[PDB]
């Protein structure tokens, strides 16, 4: 069980961006009800999301930011031959440490 200890300006949300993860994903596994954090505060993490269908609308930037990584990471990852992405394309993700 992964966590992240909570400093001075964080938020749900840029703390979320940093690890790939979702705000409704750490409320849900921590219980939370409010976007109200303190300093000092440990929120566990969920693990990393390994694979992402490619939905219409998605693009690398996007996705890059929504799993905390780089369009350079996702195309090394998955063998793009450049940097478009295709519906139905499984993506893999990188673990923790590539990110
Ligand atoms: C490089 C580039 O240009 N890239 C862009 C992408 O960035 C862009 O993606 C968009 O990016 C937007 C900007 O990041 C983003 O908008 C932001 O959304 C989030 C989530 O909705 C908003 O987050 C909320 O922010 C407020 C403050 O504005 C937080 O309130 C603060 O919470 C803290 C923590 O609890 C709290 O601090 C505590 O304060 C008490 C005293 O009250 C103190 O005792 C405690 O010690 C203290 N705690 C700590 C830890 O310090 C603080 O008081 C309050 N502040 C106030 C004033 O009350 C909310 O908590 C926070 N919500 C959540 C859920 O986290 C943020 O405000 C938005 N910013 C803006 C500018 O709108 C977009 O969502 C994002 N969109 C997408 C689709 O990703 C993309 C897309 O355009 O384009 C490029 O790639
Ligand atoms: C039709 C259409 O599609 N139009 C498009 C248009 O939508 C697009 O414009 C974009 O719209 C989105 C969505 O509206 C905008 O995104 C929103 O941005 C705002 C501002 O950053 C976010 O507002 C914050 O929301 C949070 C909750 O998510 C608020 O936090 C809550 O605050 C209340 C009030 O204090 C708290 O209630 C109090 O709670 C205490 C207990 O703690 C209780 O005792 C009190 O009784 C209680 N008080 C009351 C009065 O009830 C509450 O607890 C707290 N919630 C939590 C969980 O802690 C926060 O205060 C809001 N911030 C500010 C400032 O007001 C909003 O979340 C966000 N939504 C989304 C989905 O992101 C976006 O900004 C906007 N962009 C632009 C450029 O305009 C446009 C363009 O995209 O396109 C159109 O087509």
Same mark, same amino acid.
Do not use: C, W
């Given at each position: 069980? *992964?966590?992240?200890?909570? +400093?001075?300006?964080?938020? =749900?949300?840029?703390? +979320?961006? @940093?690890? %790939?993860?979702?705000? &409704?994903?750490? /409320? @849900? #596994?921590? $219980?939370? &009800?409010?976007? #109200? =954090?303190?300093? %000092? ?7 990393? &999301? ?9 693009? #690398?930037?996007?996705? *890059? ?8 990471? #996702? /195309?090394? =990852? ?9 519906? %139905? ?6 673990? &923790? $440490?590539?990110?």
């Amino acid at each position: 069980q *992964a966590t992240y200890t909570v +400093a001075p300006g964080d938020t =749900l949300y840029s703390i +979320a961006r @940093r690890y %790939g993860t979702t705000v &409704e994903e750490l /409320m @849900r #596994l921590n $219980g939370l &009800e409010s976007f #109200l =954090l303190q300093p %000092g505060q440990v929120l566990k993490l969920p693990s990393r &999301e390994r694979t992402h269908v490619v939905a219409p609308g998605d693009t #690398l930037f996007s996705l *890059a930011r929504r799993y905390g990584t780089t369009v350079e990471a #996702l /195309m090394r =990852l998955n063998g793009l031959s450049s940097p478009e992405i295709k519906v %139905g394309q499984v993506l893999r993700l990188p673990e &923790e $440490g590539e990110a």
